[PDB]
Amino acid sequence: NRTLRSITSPLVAHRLKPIRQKTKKAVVSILDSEEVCVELVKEYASQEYVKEVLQISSDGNTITIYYPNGGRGFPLADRPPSPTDNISRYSFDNLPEKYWRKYQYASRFVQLVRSKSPKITYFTRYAKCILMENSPGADFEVWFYDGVKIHKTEDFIQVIEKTGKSYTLKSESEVNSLKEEIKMYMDHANEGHRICLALESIISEEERKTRSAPFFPIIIGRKP
Amino acid sequence: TLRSITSPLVAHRLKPIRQKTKKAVVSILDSEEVCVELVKEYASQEYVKEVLQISSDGNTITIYYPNGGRGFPLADRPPSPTDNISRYSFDNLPEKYWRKYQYASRFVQLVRSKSPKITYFTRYAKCILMENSPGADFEVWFYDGVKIHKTEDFIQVIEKTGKSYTLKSESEVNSLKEEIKMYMDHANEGHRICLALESIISEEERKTRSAPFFPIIIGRKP
């Protein structure tokens, strides 16, 4: 009784800008509509062809599957070809098992994009703070005006000094063992993170009550 | 006693700027202080006889006469404070300087009225709430070419053609073409949203003494 949820949640492409990533086996697109397409590609004599398409909704719950050109395929393009009347469609929890891995190409890619997609940008006296869209436990980058950079993940905290010297902090035991000057930077970043999380929370609540256009992303303040 | 005429100006979050008037030369510094340079014309050149320097909250005023009242000449930055320094609270300020404080006070209001505090992108328009609270101005730049401008007195409308008109009453707005009321309704919808947000962010800013939460840009142009 292994399920698709076991492996992944439904992807979430809201507020993400269009982007197209080409690998050897698959091409993955976030469209202008915020739908996510996986084009599966075969090479026939120095030319890429699209033989299968998965068209996933922006909330990841609906998967439409089709085979361009009645299974013969079309040459690869900038955009994925459109469905005809010949389609199969599934809900997330009804998607057959053979499509699971191909859904993951999309999930994994959407998580990557989110993790580099600014949700809240917050200019301080010393830093530019960015909370990314890949919640929960979203990434947080802090670009100090003097050149220092701190990047928080749910796995580690990377620090890059002005030199370009860099190291990872995998622990909380590690955090405190630093050189005081670096602990100041780290403190400012934690301050910035708290503020961005509070504002995310309150603005999100207002968004939910308000029938209107998105309140994200936001840019708060300006650079000195 | 000066409280009788105007309020202390407020230059928080405003960007630096320098304007020559007929009266003086008014400047918002990088420090967010505000300098009034009063300039006479001896020879045919410009000389600064007096300088008023007001803090960003408008409550502290520093006055100094460069060169004893002889006057250092006009530059692009204002002259450093000399020996002859006076400093006052807003409420302690001698009447001699009131009209000169109003020069600064009105300039800052003008600048505030044109300074975005909240920018918010909707499906149809770019809405901006301005910094001149209370009752800040609110401009709506619809993507199709219409513009609406909500002062606390009046509401200016500008059609795609450029046809402009002003509305000062509930009776005037009601007798508007149907398409224009649609625009007006979007504008008012956006106003409320910006006002609600302003309140919640402002609330949270008080609870978190930190770098300013304004200006803010919300969403993107589609």
Q: B206 at the A interface (CB within 8 A)?
A: no
Distance of alpha carbon A101 from alpha carbon A136, whole angstroms? 23
Distance of alpha carbon B84 from alpha carbon B73, whole angstroms? 17
Nearest CA in chain A to B186: A212
Residue A185's alpha-carbon distances to A7, A78, A148, in angstroms, are: 37, 43, 8
Beta bridge partners of B204: none
Residue with tokens 């599934």: A90
Output Rg (C-alpha) for chain B, integer angstroms.
Answer: 21
CA distance B214 to chain A (A): 5
Q: Which of A118, A156, A157 lies closest to A135 in space, CA to CA?
A: A118
Q: B47 at the A interface (CB within 8 A)?
A: no
CA-angle at B39, arms to B38 and B43, nearest 5°? 165
Residue B188 amino acid letter: N
Residue A185 amino acid letter: Y
DSSP 8-state code for residue A6: H
Closest to A221 (Cβ–Cβ): which among B197, B213, B220?
Answer: B213
Nearest CA in chain B to A198: B204
Distance of alpha carbon B195 from alpha carbon A196, whole angstroms? 20
**Count of residues for chain A?**
224
Distance of alpha carbon A120 from alpha carbon A135, whole angstroms? 12
Q: Is B200's CB within 8 Å of A221's CB?
A: no
CA distance A179 to chain B (A): 25
> Which residues of chain B have a CB within 8 Å of the CB of A125?
211
CB B27 within 8 A of CB B52: no
Distance of alpha carbon B50 from alpha carbon B65, whole angstroms? 5
Q: Is B218's CB within 8 Å of A218's CB?
A: yes
> Which residues of chain B have a CB within 8 Å of the CB of A206?
196-197, 200
Q: B212 at the A interface (CB within 8 A)?
A: yes
Residue A94's alpha-carbon distances to A38, A66, A83, A98, B216, in angstroms, are: 18, 16, 20, 12, 43
> Which residues of chain A have a CB within 8 Å of the CB of B208?
195, 198
List of domains in chain A: 3-117 (3.30.1120.120), 118-224 (3.30.1120.130)
Q: In a 3-state reduction of DSSP, which class is residue A102?
A: helix
Distance of alpha carbon B220 from alpha carbon A102, whole angstroms? 32
Question: Long-range contacts made by residues A14-23, C-beta under 8 angstroms, separation at least 24?
Answer: A14/A58, A14/A59, A15/A117, A15/A119, A15/A133, A15/A214, A15/A216, A15/A217, A16/A110, A16/A113, A16/A114, A16/A117, A16/A133, A17/A117, A19/A113, A20/A78, A21/A109
Resolution (A): 2.7
Nearest CA in chain A to B216: A220
Distance of alpha carbon B198 from alpha carbon B216, whole angstroms? 10
Q: Is B211's CB within 8 Å of A198's CB?
A: no
Q: Tokens at residue A114, please?
A: 């989110």
DSSP character string of B136-182? --EEEEETTS-EEEE-SS-EEEE-SS--EEEE-SHHHHHTS-HHHHH
Beta bridge partners of B142: B125
Task: Give the number of beta-carbon pairs within 8 Å between A and B.
Answer: 56
Beta strands in chain A (DSSP E): 19-22, 26-30, 36-43, 48-56, 62-66, 74-75, 88-91, 118-123, 127-132, 140-144, 149-152, 157-160, 166-169, 218-220
CB B103 within 8 A of CB B24: yes
Q: How would you class A152 by CB atoms within 10 Å of its CB: exposed for 0-12, middle for 13-18, buried for 19 or more?
A: buried
Q: Which of B197, B176, B177, B180 lies closest to B127 in space, CA to CA?
A: B197
Q: Which of A91, A94, A77 lies closest to A3 in space, CA to CA?
A: A94
> Which residues of chain A have a CB within 8 Å of the CB of B31?
none
Q: In a 3-state reduction of DSSP, which class is residue A64?
A: strand
Q: In a 3-state reduction of DSSP, which class is residue A158?
A: strand
Residue with tokens 């400047």: B27
CA-angle at A111, arms to A49 and A113, nearest 5°? 70
CA distance A145 to chain B (A): 15
Distance of alpha carbon A28 from alpha carbon B90, whole angstroms? 64
Q: Is B193's CB within 8 Å of A203's CB?
A: no
CA distance B211 to chain A (A): 5
Q: Is B122's CB within 8 Å of A202's CB?
A: no
Q: A117 at the B interface (CB within 8 A)?
A: no
Cβ neighbors of A200 (< 8 A, separation 6 or more) are A119, A120, A131
- B6 C-beta neighbours (distance < 10 Å), count: 16
* Contacts with A, B 123-162, CB within 8 Å: 123
CB B176 within 8 A of CB B185: no
In angstroms, the first-to-last Cα distance of chain A is 57
Q: A216 at the B interface (CB within 8 A)?
A: yes
Nearest CA in chain A to B208: A195
Closest to B219 (Cβ–Cβ): which among A123, A213, A222?
Answer: A213
Q: Is B196's CB within 8 Å of A210's CB?
A: yes
CA distance A187 to chain B (A): 13
Q: In a 3-state reduction of DSSP, which class is residue B115?
A: coil
DSSP 8-state code for residue B7: P
> Which residues of chain B have a CB within 8 Å of the CB of A214?
218-219
